[PDB]
Symmetry: C4
Amino acid sequence: TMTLAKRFTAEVVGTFILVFFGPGAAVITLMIANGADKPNEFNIGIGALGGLGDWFAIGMAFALAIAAVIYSLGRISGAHINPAVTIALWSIGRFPGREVVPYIVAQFIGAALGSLLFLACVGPAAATVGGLGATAPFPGIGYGQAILTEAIGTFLLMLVIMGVAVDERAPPGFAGLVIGLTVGGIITTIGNITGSSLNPARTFGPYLGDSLMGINLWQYFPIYVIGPIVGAVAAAWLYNYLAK
Amino acid sequence: TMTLAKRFTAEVVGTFILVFFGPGAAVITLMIANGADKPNEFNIGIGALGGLGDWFAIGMAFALAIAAVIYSLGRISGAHINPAVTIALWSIGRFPGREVVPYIVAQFIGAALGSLLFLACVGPAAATVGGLGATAPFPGIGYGQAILTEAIGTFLLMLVIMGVAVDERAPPGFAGLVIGLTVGGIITTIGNITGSSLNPARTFGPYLGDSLMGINLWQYFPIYVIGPIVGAVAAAWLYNYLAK
Amino acid sequence: MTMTLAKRFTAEVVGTFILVFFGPGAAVITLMIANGADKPNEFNIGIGALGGLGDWFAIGMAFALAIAAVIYSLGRISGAHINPAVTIALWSIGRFPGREVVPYIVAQFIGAALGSLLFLACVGPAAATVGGLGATAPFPGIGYGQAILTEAIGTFLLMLVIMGVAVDERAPPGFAGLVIGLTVGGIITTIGNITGSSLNPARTFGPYLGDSLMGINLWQYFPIYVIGPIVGAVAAAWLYNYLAKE
Amino acid sequence: TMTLAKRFTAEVVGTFILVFFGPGAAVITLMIANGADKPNEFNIGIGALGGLGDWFAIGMAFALAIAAVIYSLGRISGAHINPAVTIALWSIGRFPGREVVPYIVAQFIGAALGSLLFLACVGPAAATVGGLGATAPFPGIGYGQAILTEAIGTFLLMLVIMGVAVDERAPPGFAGLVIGLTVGGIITTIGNITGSSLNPARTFGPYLGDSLMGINLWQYFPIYVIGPIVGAVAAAWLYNYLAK
Ligand SMILES: CCCCCCCCO[C@@H]1O[C@H](CO)[C@@H](O)[C@H](O)[C@H]1O
Ligand SMILES: CCCCCCCCO[C@@H]1O[C@H](CO)[C@@H](O)[C@H](O)[C@H]1O
Ligand SMILES: CCCCCCCCO[C@@H]1O[C@H](CO)[C@@H](O)[C@H](O)[C@H]1O
Ligand SMILES: CCCCCCCCO[C@@H]1O[C@H](CO)[C@@H](O)[C@H](O)[C@H]1O
Ligand SMILES: CCCCCCCCO[C@@H]1O[C@H](CO)[C@@H](O)[C@H](O)[C@H]1O
């Protein structure tokens, strides 16, 4: 088992790729669709040109990136790339408490780096037109519902993480592909309701870049901390109850 | 194995996710596409912006969710999340008769919960504009053809379920992924003909929420009971005849 | 459980039926739902009109996931050839009995006609008059010369995968169905708007029958979907062996 | 191992299929979308009809082709079909130096063949309208950023190649599928920034056909040599540091 110093840097490089490519697709969708007829308020540009196919596109950007990361770095850090996962796994005694805060920091640092680097790669348009793919409720969606859809979202994620990754009886090698594809699915449905974050670090990244680029959104941050965690811890604890 | 009480609650939580995310994509497609030019009668808003890609998006929302459920819960309840499967497996003596009615109830309860919760998450728009993703025949499609396409649909599903899940010679671990992706495929073709239900619990959920939200559609329910069961039992029995 | 030929025949019918019901069935539904939308040039015939190339990947995936489903359920029984070019290619390497090539191809053709006809019944005449029963034929500005070459280059990559992940002893077990299907899905996405990406005489036949039954005669183009696929498959099979041996 | 003569001809036939089908999708997208409303400068026709779904479509054309090639030919040549990979693997002492130049030549020859054959298959339209799918920066993207996005791109690729192919502990059989799907993912995000080449041979092919068809673009070639290599070598070396 690799030194914590190396699992930290593994968690950085992982969450960096999560936030570079995942929310990077959301930006590029918005940027190439910018100008097209948005036929109602609920449609904010994503879906304008490719309908829900735009959301699957985006979900798959996320999924296949997430999968890549697990398959390359999972053996090293565990490939958490998400604080809700770390917190959920800790709440079952599958992760050391001493390492939860160090992991989450590694995730946040990685997320900020991915968001900032994407911004540099594309130009200011990435934020002013793409929002750096930051998550926030959609037209006609309150905070109440926003956390609930984020909890129901991250509940299904963690449930798969238990079933195909943590459980001794899980078929080896499927983990990365399954976990990622699952996220990809969740984004397709949940995307146009809350931006399907499922992940505090993945929300943080853009929020920083945006508020660095003049666009302050931290009002909505709790939705992406409370929602994901209550979903993940719920999933983790339910799993164990059902499987013993 | 796990107590029936726990396989029940496993079947609820499974069918819940099946109906939350699967038909939830259908709703969100319709909602974001609401207002766009529907260039003929046959196009009812799905396909309006993203063409058949909208249907594949939707199918994948389903497929990846279904897969997630099998990989997480299949080890517990069997992950039937569908009464036609349960009835088909019983008709081969692979499932105890004592448990078919308890399973189907668990499925229906889970389906109503997933439909209701999605509704709460989004708002009334989810029903009045999205129809809660309920299945029903498409423009120029009679009841005769609607049960036949639903049979031909659920026939291919069950056939895979025999071939990659029930059969002792099936390559282990591929189950969840293959079965889900297969559904995904069916929806892509059959979607704009009957809404590709393949599943009485998956049709029931929306139908309840809709008729709770003022939109009564139970006229069409037999198409999604008869069609799927005749398809599933036909597949199960054909499989065994061919494989011995 | 090496099942009787009678049962591998009926397995090959039920397999090629699902291949032609769902595969070309997506192509029809694409056309039908997109019917009326602005086709911004000649090369766009309605597929791509609403969902761009995403419409072609949608269609390719309808094919791929159906093909995959078949292999994983019936492969253990008939071999899940569901394609005469495959049977002929495998025979040309002595991996399939000559006595069973003609019986296999007939099973495939019967299954393909049944899938095409059943889809037609399911939807209505619109399925043919508007959807063309998803029959393959060259696209605007594509000659017969190029149409067979793109169909050979197409089915060459298919058969090459079939060798590598299904026929070869050293292939990782269980991946076969998924990989072979997804591969087809890939080929359709690129080749689709050039020839309809048939890769398969039985898959072309099905629609052609239904169409010519519904008044739309297209057999002029059938050789493109017999010659092209076979020359591609037999080439792939024979190249594979040359590369992988002694 | 098979003789080098046969691994050469294996690398030709592989990179041929990479460039025929991969960039072949890009051409067909452009050709069928030719004429449609491009609602801003950043949208050059890809995305016009199917939004980002057009980019995922293209990425999957690539991914599934790449996967096919590894699964069929990887056993023979290693299925590099990419000079940056060969050069990266050499830099770790996993590939013989004597074979790096021969491999790269095989790749280039195979790429030129695939590009030329596609051109022949379709007609001049393939170049004059499709650009033979050649990669080049997008509107508002400088050379500085173009190499950085291509490095960040090919960095993720090689990182997966280490994790699921080179590493002794990698789950067997997942290689082809995972590596290809990963590329597919990268193209979806990076596509509309640089054309997501990740690969000198894959850029070369089109560039030749194009400059044969009157369209000279070699001004941009360094972006697709420097970018990919620096990304691949960085990834390879980082991996080993993290995994020992
Ligand atoms: C205990 C409830 C905490 C809320 C978790 C958020 C995800 C909601 O998920 C729900 O969890 C419930 C558990 O009570 C189950 O009864 C429901 O079927 C399930 O859909
Ligand atoms: C008929 C009088 C009873 C109230 C309606 C059903 C119970 C409340 O339920 C709510 O009703 C709203 C409609 O106003 C919906 O938007 C909500 O999503 C639904 O959950
Ligand atoms: C018999 C079970 C009652 C559960 C309390 C739900 C209260 C929602 O209220 C009512 O429910 C009734 C039954 O669905 C119907 O009259 C209407 O759908 C609804 O207005
Ligand atoms: C240092 C001198 C060693 C000479 C052996 C070189 C032959 C390489 O061998 C090839 O390598 C590929 C990837 O590298 C493998 O995947 C292939 O199976 C194999 O054909
Ligand atoms: C240090 C001596 C140089 C060895 C040359 C490479 C030999 C090929 O080694 C090969 O590596 C591949 C991964 O790329 C795998 O596909 C093969 O299973 C493995 O045998």
